[PDB]
Amino acid sequence: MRGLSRRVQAMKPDAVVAVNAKALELRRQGVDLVALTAGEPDFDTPEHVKEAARRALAQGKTKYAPPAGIPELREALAEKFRRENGLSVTPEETIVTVGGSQALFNLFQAILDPGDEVIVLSPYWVSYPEMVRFAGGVVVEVETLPEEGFVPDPERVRRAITPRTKALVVNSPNNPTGAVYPKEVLEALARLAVEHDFYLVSDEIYEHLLYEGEHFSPGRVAPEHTLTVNGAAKAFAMTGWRIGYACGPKEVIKAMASVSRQSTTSPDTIAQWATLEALTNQEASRAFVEMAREAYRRRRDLLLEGLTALGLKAVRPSGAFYVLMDTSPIAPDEVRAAERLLEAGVAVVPGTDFAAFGHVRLSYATSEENLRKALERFARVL
Amino acid sequence: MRGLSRRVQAMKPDAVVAVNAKALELRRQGVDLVALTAGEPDFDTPEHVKEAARRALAQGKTKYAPPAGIPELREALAEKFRRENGLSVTPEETIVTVGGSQALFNLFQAILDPGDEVIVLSPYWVSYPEMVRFAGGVVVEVETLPEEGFVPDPERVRRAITPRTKALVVNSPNNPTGAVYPKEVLEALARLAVEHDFYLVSDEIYEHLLYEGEHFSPGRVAPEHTLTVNGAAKAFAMTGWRIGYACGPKEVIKAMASVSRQSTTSPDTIAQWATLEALTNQEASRAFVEMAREAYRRRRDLLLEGLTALGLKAVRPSGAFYVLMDTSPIAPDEVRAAERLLEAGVAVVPGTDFAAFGHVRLSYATSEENLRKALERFARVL
Ligand SMILES: Cc1ncc(COP(=O)(O)O)c(CN[C@@H](Cc2c[nH]c3ccccc23)C(=O)O)c1O
Ligand SMILES: Cc1ncc(COP(=O)(O)O)c(CN[C@@H](Cc2c[nH]c3ccccc23)C(=O)O)c1O
């Protein structure tokens, strides 16, 4: 006959793509609002990366690359993972995907079989459930109270494990909470993964925007269970470039590569080479990051002081560039609250799809002047 | 527990990807062969496309693009479809995927539900079945005789339709045969699609590398059923860039866009703006194609002459850059035949996965002095 699939019909739109369009036609019509929806860093990607891309175009590095990505990058990848993380992977247990998304997607398609349960920790990033389910998974979620600073309690994460449980998904530095879990909790969870025998999917990516704490990887602890997902996007201001990467069990990272070969065929060649440089040129990249962090950090202190001065309540993030604000007095729920704020010319993303009810996700990853302006517009609404 | 899925385990490796690696350690050890495994044009991509890319880097066009691709490209896309094809789509009924592969993938994930049958005509391009099945489809295949020069006979394609039947997939100018189906057969096939009610998936792509015939699109005929898939790769020597596109029913084109948002998030920004230029700068592109065409046409004739002279049998392609050679006198089957040829230092791809048994796929998309040598090496094998 004709008609769409159950899976596609069944899937929810987007918390953030929504607020974006509904800016532009408010913003497209005179009304200038301030937009704190941001997932991307205001900074432009580094000149040596841009450079390297140019070098590739020139050399004619424009043909089909391997499904798992170019050797040079995989090789350089297995190295960042050791140097920076203590993971001890070889280039065969490394893969470069079309962004950290394609990694998370191709992962769940390789493990997840229908009815398999994936434990997920709320407040959580919008897409985990969508993609768990798209594969035929079953989201089994565990809350993380704000009083206990949004860091998982091992004991209860334990009492969510069932014989159908196939994966646990931990993300530190946290989006949308900004929390950064201590070593011995990643230690703890990594252990339940080994104990009950199921993968542990760690979405590291925000590792470098770390203001206060120490970033621990569980793949140091449970290497034959852990799947460590990272990407170029957030650290190197390379979101539009579309490059992410991962490492773990040789076998699953080839199930992944074969989905990749039939879905995208292989990431855009130019960008691979461009990434190779951000990775191999320590000294240059070491500085961009260094500049970006302290940068976001001052905005992080700006938002929070003005926010707290205003009366609004929020959890001081230690990493990433998000802040879940308590819309409690600005409205009675997080949706009418959201509109009230769009009315004060400031686009926020409702905590609804993150299971962060009665909260809205602020983003200081934009300008110093938008946090000053957005904080002024909040001020009047109150 | 732990282990891979029944979908990933179940998939077969790659016919072409195999021959490639197995060159390189034969190649990568003294032995130079002649590799007619080629899917890519030996020409490098046009300089105005390269420059447009540079122009984007410069302009800092490096942030997240929308899931369906940038507006400018969508609008420019909808035009190429009208102008060059007669399909009257609006940019909303247009989408830019991460290659023609991702389009074909995201498509079947949007229509195809488990047990749904997809008619596919053999000889056929390796990946169609692979990805019909990955989604939960059921390949139902129809043979096309070489005596009838590999063009489908609508009547028998008719008697393969069952109430399970959800899509038909035609690709002219054909994948490994090189055939280009007549106006009234695409007309015929497009008709059944409407009559019996089921989508028609047209994999046009090779439209521009046509030597003798006229490229007809069925979306002219059955616009509410057809899903027209094309891409930058083959025409503009842009394989490595990773960019493809499609058009059709506004509904399945955003079911598609919705998968895209969670699989790739969106194609590589730089390559979008690079493509926009190839699409809008007519005069420049109009010439590269013109050059490439006649180029491939001559190699197409060199190969055919020398092959015909040598005694070997083959079907005179009218489009694309493949030729399905009859390994009949080179060995008793198409796989031992394949090896006897790697012996004479010439890598071919066995017709086995294309359901082109007793045939082997040569590809004149390489040099005029590779056809010369490869033809020489065939000669010696006798
Ligand atoms: C925790 C997390 N994991 C992965 C990704 C995607 O990484 P990839 O390497 O695939 O690109 C993210 C990404 N992004 C944002 C999205 C977002 C928020 N506001 C936006 C405005 C415009 C465009 C995109 C926006 C997010 O965190 O919501 C994250 O965070
Ligand atoms: C008929 C047809 N449709 C789609 C594609 C894929 O196009 P996309 O825009 O996704 O890149 C193919 C093209 N080419 C090849 C497959 C092939 C050979 N060697 C390759 C290396 C890398 C990627 C793809 C390769 C083929 O016929 O062998 C086809 O043909």
Side-chain angles (χ1 to χ4, degrees):
Chain A
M1 281 189 116
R2 281 209 270 114
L4 307 196
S5 47
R6 240 249 68 61
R7 71 179 67 100
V8 122
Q9 290 190 233
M11 74 174 296
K12 175 177 305 142
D14 191 39
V16 45
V17 86
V19 235
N20 274 8
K22 195 45 178 278
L24 6 148
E25 127 256 355
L26 272 163
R27 185 196 324 162
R28 195 9 223 190
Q29 72 160 340
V31 193
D32 96 294
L33 58 242
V34 190
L36 308 162
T37 69
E40 47 212 355
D42 63 320
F43 301 110
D44 200 356
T45 116
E47 257 289 306
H48 58 289
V49 183
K50 287 191 167 184
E51 187 75 25
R54 300 184 184 126
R55 227 117 61 176
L57 275 171
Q59 276 217 59
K61 300 268 200 54
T62 128
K63 270 56 195 142
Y64 282 127
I70 54 174
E72 299 86 358
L73 213 208
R74 287 184 75 195
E75 303 209 330
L77 229 27
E79 197 48 53
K80 156 259 172 293
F81 280 131
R82 269 209 326 102
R83 250 172 48 229
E84 310 181 350
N85 297 131
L87 271 54
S88 318
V89 308
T90 62
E92 291 239 27
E93 317 191 321
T94 250
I95 189 182
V96 42
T97 63
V98 181
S101 292
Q102 165 139 111
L104 279 160
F105 186 70
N106 289 2
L107 198 190
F108 297 140
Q109 300 270 300
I111 51 164
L112 273 342
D113 226 4
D116 284 342
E117 303 182 343
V118 179
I119 298 186
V120 163
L121 312 95
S122 55
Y124 62 74
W125 178 47
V126 173
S127 275
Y128 289 145
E130 283 304 306
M131 57 195 339
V132 168
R133 299 179 187 131
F134 196 86
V138 174
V139 168
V140 169
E141 64 163 82
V142 187
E143 164 79 54
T144 51
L145 297 325
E147 48 257 61
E148 53 167 33
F150 294 123
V151 168
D153 166 30
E155 280 313 293
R156 68 154 121 281
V157 171
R158 177 186 314 279
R159 58 176 174 89
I161 301 175
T162 73
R164 283 177 289 294
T165 290
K166 194 180 199 159
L168 170 45
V169 169
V170 56
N171 171 206
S172 176
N174 212 309
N175 156 6
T177 153
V180 72
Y181 315 152
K183 195 186 59 46
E184 5 65 27
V185 174
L186 284 320
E187 193 100 350
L189 308 170
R191 204 165 298 126
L192 309 213
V194 172
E195 182 182 1
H196 302 64
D197 175 69
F198 61 82
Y199 302 92
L200 204 217
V201 176
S202 190
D203 190 43
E204 285 171 20
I205 310 214
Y206 288 84
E207 59 162 312
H208 288 121
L209 324 177
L210 186 39
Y211 320 131
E212 29 275 332
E214 123 250 75
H215 180 76
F216 172 76
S217 307
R220 172 180 162 221
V221 174
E224 66 176 34
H225 286 70
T226 269
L227 242 160
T228 339
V229 182
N230 211 287
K234 316 260 171 291
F236 310 140
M238 274 173 67
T239 51
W241 290 77
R242 302 324 313 150
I243 274 200
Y245 30 75
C247 66
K250 214 191 193 76
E251 39 274 299
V252 47
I253 318 175
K254 171 188 273 206
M256 280 185 210
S258 200
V259 166
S260 194
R261 241 182 173 99
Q262 306 244 315
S263 51
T264 56
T265 269
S266 176
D268 155 76
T269 308
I270 305 303
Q272 316 231 59
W273 288 108
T275 304
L276 210 186
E277 171 70 21
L279 286 189
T280 55
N281 189 317
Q282 256 100 296
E283 291 292 344
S285 303
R286 168 225 258 150
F288 176 53
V289 181
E290 279 322 297
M291 178 217 79
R293 186 199 295 93
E294 302 290 316
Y296 312 132
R297 193 213 299 277
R298 315 228 270 230
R299 307 182 182 167
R300 193 290 300 272
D301 283 331
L302 216 310
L303 212 227
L304 268 286
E305 290 180 13
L307 243 187
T308 281
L310 277 187
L312 303 121
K313 307 168 186 286
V315 133
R316 197 214 66 139
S318 294
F321 46 54
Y322 308 112
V323 169
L324 270 191
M325 173 186 72
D326 194 25
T327 69
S328 177
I330 220 174
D333 75 354
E334 80 292 331
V335 198
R336 292 182 300 233
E339 309 191 84
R340 166 86 181 244
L341 281 173
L342 214 207
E343 269 146 29
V346 70
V348 294
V349 184
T352 304
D353 297 355
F354 303 85
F357 318 117
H359 279 94
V360 91
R361 193 194 75 162
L362 299 183
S363 185
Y364 50 88
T366 73
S367 143
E368 241 286 281
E369 185 184 357
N370 303 168
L371 289 150
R372 240 147 225 231
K373 198 193 298 172
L375 221 293
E376 177 188 83
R377 310 220 186 162
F378 280 179
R380 304 196 252 110
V381 119
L382 303 170
Chain B
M1 209 72 136
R2 281 209 270 114
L4 290 301
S5 32
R6 207 259 315 125
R7 67 178 61 107
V8 122
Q9 285 191 237
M11 62 197 302
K12 149 150 73 283
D14 223 326
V16 45
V17 155
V19 63
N20 276 6
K22 290 183 53 63
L24 3 163
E25 178 178 350
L26 171 54
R27 178 177 180 183
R28 197 143 197 258
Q29 285 195 59
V31 194
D32 102 278
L33 44 240
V34 188
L36 309 174
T37 61
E40 42 205 342
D42 55 308
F43 300 95
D44 195 349
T45 116
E47 262 287 304
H48 56 298
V49 332
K50 288 191 167 184
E51 188 81 35
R54 298 179 190 133
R55 216 140 59 190
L57 292 164
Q59 298 183 213
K61 297 280 189 49
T62 129
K63 272 105 188 81
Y64 282 128
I70 53 173
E72 299 85 359
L73 215 206
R74 293 191 72 173
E75 300 194 322
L77 228 27
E79 186 66 12
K80 163 253 171 295
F81 277 119
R82 293 163 155 121
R83 185 202 137 355
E84 267 147 8
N85 297 130
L87 288 81
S88 51
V89 305
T90 73
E92 286 64 25
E93 315 179 320
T94 250
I95 190 181
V96 44
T97 66
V98 186
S101 295
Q102 154 130 120
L104 279 159
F105 186 82
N106 292 13
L107 195 178
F108 297 120
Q109 291 284 305
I111 51 163
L112 273 342
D113 258 346
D116 284 342
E117 302 181 343
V118 178
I119 298 186
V120 162
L121 314 92
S122 66
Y124 61 73
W125 178 46
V126 173
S127 267
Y128 291 140
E130 279 304 309
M131 59 203 307
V132 158
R133 284 184 203 122
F134 191 77
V138 175
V139 176
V140 169
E141 61 161 78
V142 188
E143 180 180 4
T144 63
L145 291 323
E147 298 300 357
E148 49 166 41
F150 299 121
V151 324
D153 170 28
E155 284 315 304
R156 72 152 128 272
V157 170
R158 173 185 291 199
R159 51 167 180 90
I161 300 175
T162 73
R164 271 147 292 146
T165 294
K166 198 172 201 175
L168 169 47
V169 144
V170 338
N171 159 205
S172 160
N174 202 295
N175 203 322
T177 142
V180 72
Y181 315 153
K183 174 202 154 300
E184 4 64 48
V185 174
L186 285 318
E187 289 260 341
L189 308 178
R191 200 157 300 127
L192 299 216
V194 200
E195 206 171 296
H196 301 65
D197 177 47
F198 61 82
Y199 302 87
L200 204 217
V201 176
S202 189
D203 193 43
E204 287 172 19
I205 188 180
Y206 288 84
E207 59 162 323
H208 288 120
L209 325 184
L210 178 46
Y211 319 131
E212 54 250 303
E214 294 177 2
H215 180 77
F216 172 79
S217 309
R220 287 166 163 81
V221 175
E224 57 179 66
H225 287 70
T226 273
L227 255 157
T228 339
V229 181
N230 212 293
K234 315 276 172 279
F236 310 140
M238 294 183 48
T239 79
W241 290 85
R242 292 331 299 152
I243 270 194
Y245 30 75
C247 66
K250 211 198 200 79
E251 42 153 11
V252 36
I253 278 192
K254 90 174 125 192
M256 280 184 207
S258 204
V259 168
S260 195
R261 30 174 59 91
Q262 316 221 300
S263 46
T264 71
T265 268
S266 89
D268 164 49
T269 308
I270 305 302
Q272 299 213 70
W273 293 105
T275 305
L276 209 190
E277 172 91 4
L279 291 191
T280 60
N281 187 316
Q282 258 113 274
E283 184 269 356
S285 304
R286 277 134 91 138
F288 178 78
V289 181
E290 299 310 343
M291 173 188 96
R293 290 262 291 291
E294 307 297 302
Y296 308 119
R297 184 184 213 259
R298 152 169 161 54
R299 307 182 181 166
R300 194 289 298 267
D301 296 329
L302 207 312
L303 219 205
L304 279 200
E305 182 85 22
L307 251 176
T308 223
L310 283 185
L312 305 124
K313 303 162 185 283
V315 268
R316 194 160 194 128
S318 294
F321 46 51
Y322 308 111
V323 169
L324 271 186
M325 177 169 76
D326 189 26
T327 70
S328 243
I330 215 162
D333 82 319
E334 79 292 331
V335 194
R336 299 184 298 229
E339 302 177 2
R340 128 76 65 112
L341 280 173
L342 220 204
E343 300 223 348
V346 70
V348 293
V349 184
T352 304
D353 286 9
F354 303 85
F357 310 119
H359 279 93
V360 68
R361 191 191 79 166
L362 311 178
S363 175
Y364 50 88
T366 78
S367 288
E368 285 108 359
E369 210 237 349
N370 280 175
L371 292 156
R372 292 181 191 168
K373 197 183 295 167
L375 217 266
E376 180 182 287
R377 302 205 196 168
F378 279 179
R380 297 192 180 153
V381 130
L382 266 203

